[PDB]
Chain A
Amino acid sequence: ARTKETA
Chain B
Amino acid sequence: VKPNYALKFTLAGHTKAVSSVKFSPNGEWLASSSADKLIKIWGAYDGKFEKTISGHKLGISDVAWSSDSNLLVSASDDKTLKIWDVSSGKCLKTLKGHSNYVFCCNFNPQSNLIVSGSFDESVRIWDVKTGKCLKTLPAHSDPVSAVHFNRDGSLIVSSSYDGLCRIWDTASGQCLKTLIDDDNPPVSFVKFSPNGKYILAATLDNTLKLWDYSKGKCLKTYTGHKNEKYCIFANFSVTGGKWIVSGSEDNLVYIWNLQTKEIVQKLQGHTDVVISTACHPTENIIASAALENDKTIKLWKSDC
Interface of A toward B, CB cutoff 8 Å = 1-7
* Docked pose: A4 CA to B60 CA in angstroms: 11
Contact residues in A for B275 (Cβ distance below 8 Å): 2-3
B59 touching A3, Cβ below 8 Å: yes
B60 touching A5, Cβ below 8 Å: no
Contact flag A2-B161 (CB < 8 Å), given A7-B186, A7-B204: no
Q: Which residue on A lies nearest to B59, using beta carbons?
A: A1
* Docked pose: A2 CA to B204 CA in angstroms: 14
* Docked pose: A2 CA to B44 CA in angstroms: 23
Contact residues in A for B180 (Cβ distance below 8 Å): none
B186 touching A4, Cβ below 8 Å: no
Quick one: which of A4, A5, A6 contacts B103, CB cutoff 8 A?
A5
B58 touching A5, Cβ below 8 Å: no
- B-side interface residues, number (CB < 8 Å): 26
Q: Min CB distance, A6 to chain B, in Å?
A: 6
Contact residues in A for B103 (Cβ distance below 8 Å): 2, 5
* Docked pose: A6 CA to B101 CA in angstroms: 13
Interface check B73, CB cutoff 8 A:
no
B292 touching A3, Cβ below 8 Å: yes
Contact residues in A for B20 (Cβ distance below 8 Å): 2
Secondary structure dominating the interface of B: loop
Interface of B toward A, CB cutoff 8 Å = 16-20, 34-35, 58-62, 76-77, 101, 103, 142, 161, 186, 204, 229-231, 275, 291-292
* Docked pose: A3 CA to B14 CA in angstroms: 13
List 15 contacting pairs A-B, 8 Å CB cutoff, sorted by A: A1-B19, A1-B58, A1-B59, A1-B60, A1-B61, A1-B77, A2-B20, A3-B16, A3-B19, A3-B291, A4-B17, A5-B101, A6-B229, A7-B142, A7-B229
Q: Which residue on A lies nearest to B272, using beta carbons?
A: A3
Q: Min CB distance, B189 to chain A, in Å?
A: 10
Q: Min CB distance, B276 to chain A, in Å?
A: 8
Q: Which residue on B lies nearest to A3, using beta carbons?
A: B17
* Docked pose: A7 CA to B204 CA in angstroms: 9
* Docked pose: A1 CA to B242 CA in angstroms: 31
Known contacts A3-B17, A5-B61; can you find 8 more A-B pairs with CB under 8 A? A1-B19, A1-B58, A1-B61, A1-B76, A1-B77, A1-B101, A3-B35, A4-B292
Q: Which residue on B lies nearest to A1, using beta carbons?
A: B59
Q: Min CB distance, A7 to chain B, in Å?
A: 4
* Docked pose: A7 CA to B144 CA in angstroms: 11
Quick one: which of B16, B34, B76, B231 contacts A5, CB cutoff 8 A?
B231
Q: Min CB distance, A1 to chain B, in Å?
A: 3
